Design an enzyme around this catalytic site. Structure first.
Site, short mmCIF file in Angstrom:
data_model
loop_
_atom_site.label_atom_id
_atom_site.label_comp_id
_atom_site.label_asym_id
_atom_site.label_seq_id
_atom_site.Cartn_x
_atom_site.Cartn_y
_atom_site.Cartn_z
N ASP A 73 42.56 -74.06 4.27
CA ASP A 73 42.53 -74.75 5.55
C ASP A 73 42.68 -76.25 5.37
OD1 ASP A 73 42.16 -72.22 6.51
OD2 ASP A 73 40.01 -72.44 6.88
N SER A 113 33.78 -69.29 8.42
CA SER A 113 34.53 -70.28 9.22
C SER A 113 35.94 -70.55 8.70
CB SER A 113 33.73 -71.52 9.38
OG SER A 113 33.42 -72.06 8.12
N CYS A 114 36.51 -69.67 7.89
CA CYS A 114 37.91 -69.90 7.47
C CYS A 114 38.81 -69.70 8.69
CB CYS A 114 38.31 -69.06 6.27
SG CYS A 114 37.95 -67.31 6.47
N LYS A 115 39.87 -70.48 8.79
CA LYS A 115 40.71 -70.48 10.00
C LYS A 115 41.52 -69.19 10.19
CE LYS A 115 44.13 -73.17 12.52
NZ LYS A 115 45.28 -74.08 12.33
#
Ligand SMILES: [Zn+2]
Lengths: 331, 336, 336, 335
Positions: free
Chosen positions: D211, D248-250
């Protein structure tokens, strides 16, 4: 793997020098070597088996064979001649060679009678027939075996409890002229063979042969002559459309492939297509075979022996399925 | 997935009430619903597209269509009527609908002329033809397109640089009587359709259509009409046996499938078979399609949207392959 | 398909209800539902089975379970408590519910005795153990079961002739700090689970557990915890390099997968991966399972029932394989 | 197929007789042949390439290599020595051989500088690193590259626009003692290698490396170190459970495999597994490779050359993917 079993293995009568040359001219690059190998029963053939881990092969009469003979009497005579000849030719090697019956399929009762004769007298392992029987005054008709008049024959097959191998044959007569003559390089393995067998096999399915003869075992070469590719498609259209509209076969196409149909790897040494058929058909219903001498042992057995698949299925497809289906003793 | 492109999607002429009902009675359990949907161009069709993430569909004339008409002047007249009709019917939705040319294939030059007319005037995306053209006194003859006399047509196709979709048609006449009449439930999707297309397509291969016209793009429905199943077998027999014996096609069957041929997922919503064709054919040469209304949107699109495969191939097969092959411009939800 | 058998199906002790609910909030999206379902034995669980064509499930104690308890006397007491508890909870449904033994694995002979006790007394179908047993003053040691001191245990397993399900557990202690704490979203199904089980299972292989106990049946969830992906690679390096260098296991990795090892579909509802395992492992050695309540019935059973595969293997994987392996009785009742 | 490109191909420093012998003692049955082949750059190596239709190979430093050296100064010195050595050893065969950078990964800035130095001066095609960097007084610590302190390094990787090959390394120290010593035949290709690389690569995914560095290309050997087998499972748990809980990785794991990650066929000559990865990963993101000399050319190239798959994907995986990914010049039989 040692002790493999192959069962789409052909032989020709040595007297048919011209017919063997003609067929070789369509499907073999070395007609002389081809003729020598398709005529040989106990010499080069067993030498090949010994080099390539084949313990047992069931021999069958070359295509188109008796199905090319549209005179009933002549066809019956050839079938009897072939059956006696091969039974005598293999008798010294009962642990390496068996045979399928060669049949004239002009008349159900006559065919049943001959199958019974050679099964009981010679211990033949079943019948191998090269698709429809040529018939009619000029040989332009085709006899399919999915009509009610063939019940008496199928009842004999199941009484004997032996499988029936539905082998292809070349297209002939008006069908040949209208569809294949102008694209003749498609005749045989490339396309014509599969279209013939699959039409016939699916005729047996949809015309209820396996409903009337639930114990009937039919074997198809070449990983099932296209059918497994369309297993989803055929099943969808049978179950969701054709059956609501009137198709009355009792089972699904998948049920028939679990109970009545078999496929072999003859002339289809494709790791790709084999994996696909592990899903669509299942290792329990797949048999090793070669299609010798049209295919050579080295191609077929180099491929199979090198297959990197689970040990159980490699053993079942390689020999154990055939051992059970053909009730083979230790060979 | 949004913005999918489908391209084996049929329509009929509303005036053909009886013919449509006849065909519907063979291949649909709800003939009335079938007829309404195959006649509709802009209402229910686009509503289905909106509900199932289909951004664009290329429409084509129902089978057997013009290839069933063995009178040349009647066939040509029907082709012109269909093309003019569909061109006008889709005009309001250039971002949702395209069309393939409908052709009479009785005469190469005549077919070439009609194709050029409708590609140039209406922006048709290619041609869709339902296998051989019926011909002769009673329609018992078949016109195949793999002989050299069709060069004038194929040179026009590549000059326009548009694909040709080889669609099946039902067996008729003496062929029907000898092979199919006594096992008629196999007619259509079950078996007969694929046998016709595969024979014709491989005739194009072995009779040199792709050697004389190396830029020609031929599209086959139903994951390739059996052919990929036998790719290993055909290649083996062509390269090791038939070619030594005289077969003179320049390339291998695999090379033709990399350079000239395409397959679509029409009426073949099989995760099993698709995964197999990722190997034998390759995701670069596979196109999503439905075969509407013979198949419904929900079956095709719930299946495709649910495919658990790599994002690159999913996007290529779902829309990006078609966007390049048909040089489509920006259409509804084509970007992401 | 009706009458399916699933066997990676978890339960917890009702007295741990608050602890269970707390942890569920960290690793499950509907913690209240998760806690209620992992505690329930006969109500919602049987309801789900009836609605989704599951005839029989073999229950096991949720992970980490007894393998989290590094005090031997506490661990053994918990195992005894759990076994007696579950035997009594399922007794009214002998046609729908079975159970695996829960064991403290601190001492081989003690584990053997408890396994014999509950197999004979309650008809338990085998043992389910969550990977290594925590041990040491602070629980930072790990007891693997591939050493010679475990032979006395494996001989009891084969005496009883029941399978052993090698279930994962979370990484703990110093291993957790060093490898997982800074990439903690990988703990569990994403990665850590499979890495633990595959290490232990292949340790049993390479340290000769299946050579000393040729009848031993070990079951692995999640389609074999990575191992089938590398079947070719492991076989190549074992046979061509490691064995010449000293590796002394008698059979190949493929032979062990045909004779001793099983995989289930627990938490791996992938048609792609299943199809691959049909080749690498074989339908005879694959078992349906769910991983309830971490997975829900609908996900697992909608997937399995919709599988477009051959009827023989579908029945074997769905229920017949388990019937034979677990010596399950005839079920003279069908509530689906 | 001619003109194949392979890029997990190892060499050792000839002066390292004991280290080479030790590693070979774990992973090779013919110690003499192995030592001769891992030391040779231009003789037997090119002869094998000529025998087996390999036009170009990108060379890299043997494992564990510099990642085994826990003294920063010694580690950096070894990295520089290796880089200068291989650049000079291959200079006569620009049409057959390229090289990956060897790096000490003790310090992000230092690693960045050395990578830029040899990419610029020698035309190296990228970096190859053997998993985590051993560190600490006794080398019992591990440096992973997924923390924020590595942004300065990854920004240089993307500035140079060269890929990063994440190679396995043997387990050491307390981890070795606790998990592997009592089942040591699993060390290496059998199991320990994939477990390390997969943990590290998925750490980069979930800790957001791709990201912050969306153009970053990471290459994984051995058909992806187990990961494609669990693609469905990882995706399901990431999208449906872990992300609602805080991951929370995109993108999805599949999106990272379409944009940032690559796999090679090194030491995994399995038609079965390759066919499976055509679906889970896709031919656009798969690269041919050998893992020479731990694997031999004949094994890898007989297998690849015999693959009965479509022509498009066979040429992509065989060479065209690598030619575009590594911006390869015209090489021997590359056309
Ligand atoms: Zn390597």
């Amino acid at each position: 793997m040692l002790g493999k079993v192959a069962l789409e293995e052909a032989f020709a009568l040595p007297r048919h020098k011209e017919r063997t040359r003609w067929w070789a001219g369509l499907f073999a690059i070395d007609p002389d070597k081809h003729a020598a190998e398709i005529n040989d029963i106990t010499e080069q053939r067993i030498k090949y088996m010994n080099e390539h881990g084949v313990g047992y092969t069931i021999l069958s009469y070359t295509a188109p064979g008796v199905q090319d003979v549209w005179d009933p009497k002549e066809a019956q005579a050839l079938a009897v001649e072939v059956n006696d000849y091969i039974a005598d030719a293999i008798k010294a090697h009962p642990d390496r060679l068996g045979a399928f019956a060669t049949l004239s399929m002009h008349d159900p009762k006559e065919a049943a009678e001959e199958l019974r004769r050679v099964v009981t007298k010679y211990g033949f392992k079943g019948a191998l027939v090269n698709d429809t029987q040529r018939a009619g005054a000029d040989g332009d008709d085709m006899i399919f075996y999915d009509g009610p008049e063939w019940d008496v024959f199928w009842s004999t097959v199941t009484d004997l409890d032996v499988p029936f191998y539905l082998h292809p044959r070349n297209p002939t007569g008006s069908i040949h002229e209208k569809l294949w003559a102008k694209r003749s390089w498609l005749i045989g393995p490339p396309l014509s063979f599969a279209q013939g067998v699959s039409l016939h096999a699916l005729g047996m399915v949809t015309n209820g042969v396996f409903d009337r003869h639930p114990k009937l075992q039919i074997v198809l070469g070449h990983l099932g002559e296209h059918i497994p590719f369309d297993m989803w498609r055929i099943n969808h259209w049978f179950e969701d459309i054709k059956k609501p509209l009137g198709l009355s076969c009792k089972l699904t196409i998948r049920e028939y492939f679990a109970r009545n149909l078999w496929i072999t790897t003859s002339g289809h040494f494709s790791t790709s297509t084999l994996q696909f058929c592990l899903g669509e058909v299942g290792a329990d219903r797949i048999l090793f075979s070669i299609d010798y001498p049209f295919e050579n042992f080295s191609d077929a057995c180099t491929w199979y022996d090198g297959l990197a698949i689970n040990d159980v299925d490699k053993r079942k497809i390689g020999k154990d399925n055939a051992k059970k289906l053909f009730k083979l003793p230790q060979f």
